[PDB]
Amino acid sequence: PLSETKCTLKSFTVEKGIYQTSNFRVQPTESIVRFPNITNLCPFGEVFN
Amino acid sequence: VDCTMYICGDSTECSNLLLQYGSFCTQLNRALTGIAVEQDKNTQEVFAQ
């Protein structure tokens, strides 16, 4: 974190304060893909049952 | 502004294209930071009397 600041400021020494050096973002852990169901349920059971 | 997110972030392909512009939005991230600091100093001048 101190070296994040030193390069951001182009310096080998740092003055007191807060320096923004980057950004963080949380990435996806899973993919949720949802497509709607078919109302007219398929009669496979009419051949098997 | 997270200018990566603003232009097109969380994409390898967008990042590679955004990077062809160097510091094009970095300078604005710095300009907004400078404005926010000026606004804090301005608040202190008005109220911390």
**Phi and psi angles of residue A31, each rounded to the nearest 5 degrees, phi first:** -110, 120
Spatial distance between the Cα atoms of A18 and A34, rounded to a whole number of angstroms: 44
How many A-B residue pairs are in contact by the CB < 8 A criterion? 10
The answer to whether B31 touches A47, Cβ cutoff 8 Å, is no
The answer to whether B19 touches B3, Cβ cutoff 8 Å, is no
Half-sphere exposure of B41 (CA within 13 A, CB side): 6
Q: How many helices (H) and strands (E) does chain B have?
A: 3, 0
Token pair 């400078």 is found at B34
Among A5, A19, A23, the residue to mutate for chain B (most B Cβ within 10 A): A23
For A41, the token pair is 């349920």
Q: What is the resolution of this structure in A?
A: 5.0
Token pair 């051949």 is found at A47
- Chain A interface includes B33 (CB < 8 A): yes
Beta-carbon contacts of residue B13 (< 8 Å; ≥ 6 apart): none
Residues of A in contact with B5 (CB under 8 A): 23, 25
Experimental method: cryo-EM
The answer to whether A19 touches A5, Cβ cutoff 8 Å, is yes
